[PDB]
Symmetry: D2
């Protein structure tokens, strides 16, 4: 299978006067490229996919594709939806506009059965010829892609090559790779990046890397080179920021941190997201003081 | 406050050849009207809101409004979204096209904070002048509207008049009505309709009533009249069907039951929803046997 | 079946200088009798059954039996254990020493299967000829007595007559009484006393009644007479204290309130239970001012 | 600090005609010694601590001590209780009778606060001068020893040297060793032995090692020697058996396997534990056949 692995960033989507700040977006992506990242994920959960229109979503995929040209950095385009016809449309767009693969979140809110998830992802995978990474985040979607369903999809569809796990369930990560060791398990939970990598995970799709791209890429690359001692070191050092970036619902803290670091111009969300409490603002600012944040 | 209460049905959306079966939809609504239902909810969770387009969602709201004209039956239009700008667009549409009020589910997938939920619903309520019923279903959305948040919205926004609770949490139902007894608490969970009504709930938004409208309406009207012995007897009789209708994710069982009863022509969903297992199909058919199903 | 129902109190066990304060225990029981309580439960969870020796447990049952003689008040003796041979010993002691029935908590820590729970309670029920009330509290025991197992035990063992439920699950309470309406469902969760009683539950085993026995007794008897307006009003009034009495693990808050009320001499627990935090101490003190607390 | 780490076994307790089969108990330990195990845990959860009397509990500690005498293998005696005065008595007994250290499970059923857990373990640690390993298993006890509480106890009581974690929470394992890398984190959950060890955990207290001591000891020793490749390979091979040994509550499956393998003479439990279902019996037998089970 064609794969997209290594250190990856779930890019925040900056807003200015309620519109996507397209120049800021390209600048943030170039900062990722210059700090050792292997791929970027436009419009994942961290990019506020829910509140972008289908047009803004497509614009952000294009900006990512254009910005990574002339580099090794791949674009793993966010293309999931809880409606299969929407997810297929996003997948075809990503392929036709030069994305290297797609991320595809489990349908949220309508809770498909395992049979429905299989049919959902088969339809998506049959619509394009580029790699497809599943994405399990049950605390947000209300559903779980079972290990058996992930393995069946991996074996039955040529371009489905792995899963981003954001489930806080290392037992499930053992289950996945013990029964199907050819799949690419990708960490979607920064605090446990190293444990997932040490069990044979092959990359991360990170929130923290928005702020600290050099640290996440170093951790991932150490782990892939089997220097687990140094990968663990960075994972342990990052624990405090990894946790504080979820003191409120992601991406509220990471955008707060990017704004405090001077990396975006305004602390702007689209409703229903909004600024953190005054207390959590101060907590984020305090934890940032322990880390060295790269500029542009 | 202006209110919409009593026995209400979360309408299924019949599909045929992949499109909304508009005639069948109108006929199903007339069957509800003729069996004592007080309001209908087009395009809630049970109506597959996630997989309809915005144009089909609007078409179904229009069909409900047109079908209920000249009757006592109200239209409480499904209008929620996880993007506040989409939820405002749906609310304004419902108002402008003659809905009696709106239902508005808590944002799914993006997990807003309590402050964000407040701003989300404040924006929706300020955009129209018709009643707004909040809708809490944390197992599907990944977030919970707290009792404090519900009460503040009820007190701060003129048109927000209560909440549909689908959280299996009778403690919260006590919390709500003990601290704010003027709100309209509505059961969103058929198996516990009677406990919610007996604590001062004023209506239900039912899945089971799709199949058994006369029984749910009777349960509710007995309960509102304080004939608790008779309301409890029906709630107890309905327990088996109320639960089997969730053997797989709603609306897969209720549509399966409607098809088995001959009330819709095709057992069609939109992916990622799909037919139940062969085992659950048989369980649904077996439980239906002990209930008397009204035809057209 | 012989039954023990109505308003019942899970008695605290007062300590002084590390020993059971026997005189105080009898005094507290007399106060319960004089305030309309129908039964007292010595050495349940609220009575710190875990940290009493087998001898003290037996002393406390004996004091309760002595104190209720010549009154209408029954003794439903705490007799549970996670070891069946221990639970049978307590059951036989309770019978031989004149208890009217026994409460028997689901085995904690060792998590028996449903078959194991069935055989456990069958062994207990076969060992005595007095009423046995099962007791389900999964948040504390780590196991659940399923509705099917409760009903099988009720139907198969002639002295098992119902269940004390402390599970926050009104759906299960409907399930229980819809399939086996002859059993006595007893509320083990003060905040939802009224919803359980209004669904056909027949009593409460209360924590709050230690402090406010007259109010819990009135609620229960109103509800048993289907005077639901008055029963719900008291349940609503009691909600704030019912919840604050679990700001820390029961019985830490209720013992704190009894001490603040001047009903016991010293705020004494047996480790690992201990005095509450300073804030929760003040929180308990503040909610108490809203209620009228009977003296001796 | 003095420590007890490496590959350890939570010994089953065989029964014969309802009594501890002491001669089989010693033989099982000797088989563990012969297969590379570093320490044995008499009368933990897997040893049915709940249903042994205090005297049987003590007898099993004595057998372990005597059996391991003159060998390199240590005895980490189960000494926990939900009553602090009982846990202190067991701790002192183990010290006085030659145990190398004690395991002490968090109090079950009575749900102490974090302050209570601290005082509980401080009382135990101060009663002896041998190493004390905390033991967190919230699914069984109903309480959690927080990371902050574990770390304070480790830093404040010289003999407290680590924690056996059975919580399915690799994030917490990162939290623990990132903030206190000096403690000995011990896996109490066989399926995730390797991820816990790969993050710096220093041993396992295993259920599976009862049946396959050579495989669990090898897994642990590869990981301690930083051969993560081979430690993960064994962890992956063992996943199927590691999970099936919990198809019913531990130790119901492990005793069933020990009996099927001819290693214990009778499949006897003490109520409320009992034989597994016929189906689960069959599943266990089927999974065991894929592994090489050492004899005596
Ligand atoms: N990524 C850009 C599109 C975002 C659209 C949407 N807000 C809503 C998606 C939808 N399937 C739309 C249904 C509209 C008719 N009710 C949903 O809300 O479920 C989401 O997926 O979160
Ligand atoms: N109610 C008075 C007796 C209380 C005894 C005990 N503390 C411990 C019960 C026990 N079965 C004792 C096991 C002793 C041998 N390890 C347990 O701890 O599980 C409890 O049940 O909570
Ligand atoms: Mg640009
Ligand atoms: Mg996606
Ligand atoms: Mg009437
Ligand atoms: Mg004791
Ligand atoms: Mg009367
Ligand atoms: Mg030997
Ligand atoms: Mg122990
Ligand atoms: Mg265990």
């Amino acid at each position: 299978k064609n794969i997209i692995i290594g250190a990856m960033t779930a890019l925040i989507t900056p807003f200015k006067n309620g519109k996507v700040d397209e120049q800021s977006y390209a600048r943030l992506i170039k900062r990722q490229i210059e700090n050792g990242i292997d791929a970027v994920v436009p419009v994942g959960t961290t990019g506020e996919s829910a509140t972008l229109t289908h047009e803004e979503h497509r614009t952000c995929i294009e900006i990512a594709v254009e910005t990574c040209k002339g580099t090794k950095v791949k674009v793993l385009a966010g293309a999931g939806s809880n409606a299969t016809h929407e997810a297929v449309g996003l997948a075809k767009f990503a392929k036709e506009h030069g994305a290297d693969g797609i991320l595809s979140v489990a349908p949220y809110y309508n809770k498909p059965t395992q049979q429905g998830l299989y049919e959902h992802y088969k339809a998506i995978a049959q619509s394009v010829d580029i790699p497809v990474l599943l994405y399990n985040v049950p605390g947000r979607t209300g559903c779980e892609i079972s290990t058996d369903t992930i393995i069946k999809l991996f074996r039955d569809c040529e371009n489905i090559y792995g899963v981003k796990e954001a489930s806080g369930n290392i037992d499930k990560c053992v289950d996945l790779l013990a029964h199907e060791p050819r799949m690419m398990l990708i960490s979607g939970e920064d605090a446990i990046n190293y444990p997932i990598l040490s069990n044979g995970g092959k990359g991360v799709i990170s929130v923290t890397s928005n702020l600290l791209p050099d640290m996440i890429s170093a951790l991932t690359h150490f782990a892939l080179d089997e220097n687990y001692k140094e990968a663990k070191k960075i994972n342990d050092e990052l624990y405090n920021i990894n946790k504080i970036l979820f003191c409120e619902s992601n991406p509220i803290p990471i955008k707060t941190a990017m704004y405090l670091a001077g990396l975006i111009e305004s602390l702007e969300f689209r409703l229903p997201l909004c600024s953190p409490s005054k207390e959590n603002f101060a907590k984020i600012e305090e934890v940032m003081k322990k880390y060295k944040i790269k500029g542009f």
